[PDB]
């Protein structure tokens, strides 16, 4: 009924273990179970199929709530949300009905071992060999996945690399993570985003049934070229990422605020009497708040635009998609730079004693600093620039 | 007799284990021994007493080289260098001859358990109780020390808090760290500066002998009020800190450069062929370099000014000290800002694979994010502003 309230409940529960979990790293097994039990995994699945049928702005509010409590869980959950929509972006009506129903009925976690955003297709590690029955066999190791480990349903891409008619095609499929031959490894380590389970997954002679293949061979690339509905992949993922960062930024700001009010001491050599009345501390909080004020407002407008474009279905035009991606690109930039600035900047007001690991105050920065590198913010900014000056739209792809 | 070359040798040696040492934290036992063996501990001790007799600019270059290798070791060594000068600043010539000679001949580490920079004196934790023979007994626990643990000679402050004529005076002393009742604890933990040994030290009925008391009771406070030679305490320490930050920034920049050249991949969706030819990567390296170019140049000028004021001895004037502190305050701000900006910003050019803990790339940011909070940069900036607008000099103290 009120997924945001549910998210708030989880956030409250998770704040108590936030420091220890960041320190420990590894999979957040108990928290993934909390999410499973909450029902939120089917947030975006249509109510027709047992899901919550939430709109994009609402699902984003949930992501933000979770991200503020825990950057890793925010990304884990937010990215999970982007997987199933692929089914209606490039998959068939039959697949939509079947898989949406199973996901909501079974409260499935979804994961991906999908695109290699910065490799030419014939160099991708996971190959797809066509079989006589119209399916494929997957082989190879996807070195960077998102939530494969711990997932029930895995959205995987492979490239046909033999010399058949499908040579070079990206094959998208949704298969059970528990299928023999699929090995999601426990090898994720990073300065931040430590509990996102973003390690490697091995595929050893993994069969993909014809009916598990989403769209035609190379459907995603064909959709990108045409700015068809499948080209909504990037604006959706990018807007979710931007909101994860904004959530992390709010988490950092609120943690700092509580510390300034309760633990911080005034700088007595400056004659300050109360930490909360230091004029530079006051200015810093104003600046943090104002940076988020603009970033959040922009992000909210972008979600409404995404809702509009989404609701057009296959009637969307390349212009609709391009205008959306430009707006989202700007939000990704605003969120990246606000979150980095705030998550680092709050230390100035917290002070020396707050560097103790018991506070884990650097987890916010480490989390944003890590994920913000998924794709280069410099080209987000450039895409916006090319639109402003030249009226040009981003070239659709996995990150633009 | 090229101490900088010796320091470069150590930096080389320390390279293979920089990541592991930051990860492990604790005390840098092996590296402290390397420094002991190198002879550098007596860098600023006059040649007449067995030391190198290096000037401030040279000593600072040594600190910078070490800080670039390892921020903790840079702080540890640089802060150690600031201890013995106290003997000249407020102690007698007899004490100079005695203590400088011991430090140099024994290759001693010096540590401190000195000022509580943000507490009124009657609230300081370490009390000093005068004794019949003209010495004192120390009691209490200094909660934040610098290299007390692992030191051979400890510079300690206590406050006279009994009803006596010396009531409220700060007593400075230099005692062997092994003096009965001194217990440097192994309780240092922080997000960065992990091997600086900055934990607490307990004093249980610790006797300070009459000849170990440096200057009259309250000598430092009296020297501050008059801008006497003792007031060089802050400009020395502050300039050292700024240069530790600059060293850390260079370390980060160099780590990034090597990674960009050898490991980074071009962003192929933008059509880039070589990571080293990306125009935004090039711009970022330019901005990092330029920020350090300005901060380093200002730092160098400040070191020359410190040398000039130092060389005046007791003839320095309050204006001399004031102009110096204003300059150093500016360097502290420049170094802080540059080091935070670079140590965070290099991630943008390194990219997602560089977030793996095996690279330890966040250690640079964690180190400067931590120490930069020692005293508030906002008041460094304000002190400069007050000089610029009003011609006012900073009020001399332990941090200004």
- Region of A391 (left: φ > 0; alpha: ψ -120 to 50; beta: rest) is left
Of the candidates A230, A366, A240, A207, the one whose C-alpha atom is nearest the C-alpha of residue A309 is A230
Q: Which of A340, A374, A395 sits opposite B344 (nearest CB)?
A: A340
The count of other CB atoms within 10 Å of the CB of residue A300 is 15
The resolution, in angstroms to one decimal, equals: 1.8
**Determination technique for this entry:** X-ray
Strands (DSSP E) found in chain B: 110-113, 127-130, 136-142, 153-159, 170-176, 182-184, 201-208, 213-214
Using a CB-CB distance cutoff of 8 angstroms, which residues of chain B are in contact with residue A280? 376, 378-379, 382
The set of residues, in sequence order, having a beta carbon less than 8 Å from that of A320 and lying 6+ positions away, is A309, A312
Q: Does A355 touch chain B (CB under 8 A)?
A: yes
The set of residues, in sequence order, having a beta carbon less than 8 Å from that of B48 and lying 6+ positions away, is none
List, in sequence order, every residue forming a beta bridge with A155; answer none if it has no partner.
A112, A174
Q: To 10 degrees, the CA torsion angle through A44, A47, A51, A55?
A: 20
Query: At A12, is the secondary structure helix, strand, or coil?
Result: helix
Distances (CA, A) of B71 to A17, A345, B26, B34, B365: 30, 20, 14, 16, 10
Chain B residue nearest residue A143, CA to CA = B353
Torsions phi, psi for B363 (to 5 deg): -65, -30
- Structural domains in chain A plus CATH codes: 1-109 (1.10.540.10), 110-217 (2.40.110.10), 218-400 (1.20.140.10)
Distance of alpha carbon B262 from alpha carbon A174, whole angstroms: 36
Burial of B248-284, coded b for 16+ CB within 10 Å and e otherwise, reads bbbbbbebbbebbeeebebbebbebeebbebebbeeb
Give the DSSP H or E segment for A141.
strand A136-142
- For residue A128, how far is the Cα from the chain centroid? 26
Count the residues in chain B: 400
Distance of alpha carbon B160 from alpha carbon A5, whole angstroms: 57
Distance of alpha carbon A201 from alpha carbon A184, whole angstroms: 4
The count of other CB atoms within 10 Å of the CB of residue A29 is 10
Distance of alpha carbon B195 from alpha carbon B191, whole angstroms: 11
Q: Does A280 touch chain B (CB under 8 A)?
A: yes
Of the candidates A346, A387, A348, the one whose C-alpha atom is nearest the C-alpha of residue A368 is A346
Contact map slice: A 81-140 vs B, CB within 8 A:
117-120
Q: Does B24 touch chain A (CB under 8 A)?
A: no
Q: What is the DSSP string of A311-352?
A: HTGGG--HHHHHHHHHHHHHHHHHHHHHHHHHHHHHHHHH-G
Q: What is the DSSP string of B201-255?
A: EEEEEEEEPGGGEESSTTHHHHHHHHT-GGGGHHHHHHHHHHHHHHHHHHHHHHH
Query: At A391, is the secondary structure helix, strand, or coil?
Result: coil
Torsions phi, psi for B130 (to 5 deg): -60, 150
Q: Which of A120, A340, A355 sits opposite B190 (nearest CB)?
A: A355
Contact map slice: A 259-278 vs B, CB within 8 A:
265, 267-270
Of the candidates B153, B194, B188, the one whose C-alpha atom is nearest the C-alpha of residue B173 is B153
Distances (CA, A) of A349 to A279, A283, A346, B50, B333: 11, 10, 6, 44, 16
Of the candidates A269, A266, A196, the one whose C-alpha atom is nearest the C-alpha of residue B352 is A196
Q: What is the DSSP string of B55-113?
A: -HHHHHHHHHHHHHH-HHHHHHHHHHHTTTHHHHHHS-HHHHHHHHHHHHHHT--EEEE
Distances (CA, A) of A360 to A6, A345, A347, A365, A371: 25, 15, 12, 10, 18
List, in sequence order, every residue forming a beta bridge with A142; answer none if it has no partner.
A201
The verdict on a CB contact (< 8 Å) between B267 and A351 is no
Rounded to the nearest 10 degrees, the angle between the axes of helix B318-350 and helix B363-371 is 150
Q: Does the annotation list A145 as a binding residue?
A: yes
Q: Does A343 touch chain B (CB under 8 A)?
A: no
Q: Does B339 touch chain A (CB under 8 A)?
A: no
Of the candidates B280, B321, B296, the one whose C-alpha atom is nearest the C-alpha of residue B243 is B296
Chain A residue nearest residue B284, CA to CA = A378
The verdict on a CB contact (< 8 Å) between A373 and B344 is no
Q: Which of B191, B378, B379 sits opposite A355 (nearest CB)?
A: B191
Q: Are B47 and B10 in contact (CB under 8 A)?
A: no
Q: Are A201 and A145 in contact (CB under 8 A)?
A: yes
Q: To 10 degrees, the CA torsion angle through B134, B135, B140, B142?
A: 120
Chain B residue nearest residue A269, CA to CA = B118
Distance of alpha carbon A281 from alpha carbon A346, whole angstroms: 10
Of the candidates A59, A56, A49, A50, the one whose C-alpha atom is nearest the C-alpha of residue A96 is A49
Q: Are B13 and B73 in contact (CB under 8 A)?
A: no
> Strands B153-159 and B110-113: what pairing?
parallel
Torsions phi, psi for A341 (to 5 deg): -60, -45
Distance of alpha carbon A252 from alpha carbon A258, whole angstroms: 10
Q: Name the DSSP letter for residue A158.
A: E
With vertex at residue A364, the alpha carbon angle to CA A362 and CA A370, rounded to the nearest 5 degrees, is 100
- For residue A394, how far is the Cα from the chain centroid? 20
The verdict on a CB contact (< 8 Å) between B192 and A377 is no
Of the candidates A165, A192, A153, the one whose C-alpha atom is nearest the C-alpha of residue A70 is A192
Torsions phi, psi for A349 (to 5 deg): -90, -25
Q: Does B399 touch chain A (CB under 8 A)?
A: yes
Distance of alpha carbon A234 from alpha carbon B135, whole angstroms: 73
Q: Are B149 and B199 in contact (CB under 8 A)?
A: yes
Q: What is the DSSP string of A43-111?
A: TTS-GGGTS----HHHHHHHHHHHHHH-HHHHHHHHHHHHHTHHHHHHS-HHHHHHHHHHHHHHT--EE
Distances (CA, A) of A248 to A67, A285, A336, A363, B204: 6, 16, 10, 9, 46
Measure in Å the smallest separation between the Cα of A86 and chain B Cα atoms.
21
Using a CB-CB distance cutoff of 8 angstroms, which residues of chain A are in contact with residue B265? 118
Q: To 10 degrees, the CA torsion angle through B236, B242, B244, B250?
A: -150
The set of residues, in sequence order, having a beta carbon less than 8 Å from that of B369 and lying 6+ positions away, is A344, A347, A355, A362, A365, B191, B192, B340, B343
Q: Are A345 and A285 in contact (CB under 8 A)?
A: no
Distances (CA, A) of B9 to B12, B35, B134: 5, 11, 46
Distance of alpha carbon A101 from alpha carbon A105, whole angstroms: 6
Torsions phi, psi for A113 (to 5 deg): -140, 70
Q: Does B286 touch chain A (CB under 8 A)?
A: no
The count of other CB atoms within 10 Å of the CB of residue A37 is 11
Measure in Å the smallest separation between the Cα of B168 and chain A Cα atoms.
17
Give the DSSP H or E segment for B390.
helix B377-390
Q: Which of A120, A356, A373 sits opposite B268 (nearest CB)?
A: A120
Chain A residue nearest residue B346, CA to CA = A369
Query: At A302, is the secondary structure helix, strand, or coil?
Result: helix
Burial of A177-216, coded b for 16+ CB within 10 Å and e otherwise, reads bebeebbbeeebebbbbbbbbbbbbbbeebebeeebbbbe
Distances (CA, A) of A199 to A186, A300, A317, A322, A398: 7, 31, 36, 32, 19
Q: Does B370 touch chain A (CB under 8 A)?
A: yes
What number of CA atoms fall less than 13 Å from residue B284's CA on the CB side? 25
Q: Are A157 and A115 in contact (CB under 8 A)?
A: yes
List, in sequence order, every residue forming a beta bridge with B111; answer none if it has no partner.
B154
State the burial class of residue B34 (Cβ atoms within 10 Å of its Cβ: 0-12, 13-18, 19+). Answer: middle
Distance of alpha carbon A368 from alpha carbon A347, whole angstroms: 15
């Amino acid at each position: 009924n009120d997924p945001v309230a549910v998210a708030r409940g989880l956030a409250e529960k998770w704040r108590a273990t936030a420091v220890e979990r960041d320190r420990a790293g590894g999979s957040a097994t108990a928290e993934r179970e909390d999410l499973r039990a909450s029902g939120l995994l089917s947030l975006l699945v249509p109510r027709e199929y047992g899901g919550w049928g939430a709109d994009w702005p609402t699902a984003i509010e949930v992501v933000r709530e979770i991200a503020a409590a825990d950057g890793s869980l925010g990304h884990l959950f937010g990215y999970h949300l982007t997987n199933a929509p692929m089914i209606e972006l490039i998959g068939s009506q039959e697949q939509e009905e079947h898989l949406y129903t199973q996901i909501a009925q079974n409260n499935w976690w979804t994961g991906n071992a999908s695109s290699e955003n910065n490799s030419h297709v014939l160099d991708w590690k996971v190959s797809a060999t066509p079989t006589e029955d119209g399916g494929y066999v997957l082989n190879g190791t996807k070195h960077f996945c998102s939530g494969a480990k711990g997932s029930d349903l895995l959205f995987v891409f492979g490239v046909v690399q033999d010399d058949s008619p499908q040579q070079g095609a990206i094959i998208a499929a949704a298969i059970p993570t528990s299928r023999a031959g699929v090995t999601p490894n426990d090898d994720w380590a990073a300065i931040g985003m430590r509990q996102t389970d973003s390690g490697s997954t091995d595929f050893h002679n993994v069969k993909v049934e014809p009916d598990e293949v989403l769209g035609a061979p190379n459907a995603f690339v064909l959709a990108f070229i045409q700015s068809e509905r499948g080209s909504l992949f990037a604006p959706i993922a990018q807007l979710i990422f931007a909101n994860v960062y904004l959530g992390i930024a709010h988490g950092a700001l609120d943690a700092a605020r509580e510390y300034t009010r309760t633990q911080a001491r005034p700088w007595t050599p400056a004659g300050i009497q109360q930490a909360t009345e230091d004029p530079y501390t006051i200015r810093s909080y104003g600046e943090f708040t104002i940076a988020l004020q603009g970033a959040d407002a922009a992000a909210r407008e972008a979600a409404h635009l995404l809702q509009t474009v989404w609701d057009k279905g296959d009637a969307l035009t390349p212009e609709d998609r391009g205008e959306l991606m430009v707006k989202v690109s700007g939000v990704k930039a605003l969120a990246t730079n606000a979150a980095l600035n705030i998550s680092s900047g709050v230390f100035e007001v917290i002070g020396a004693r707050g560097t103790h690991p018991r506070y884990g105050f650097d987890r916010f920065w480490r989390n944003v600093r890590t994920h913000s590198l998924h794709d280069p913010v410099s080209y987000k900014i450039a895409d916006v620039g090319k639109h402003t000056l030249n009226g040009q739209y981003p070239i659709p792809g996995f990150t633009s």
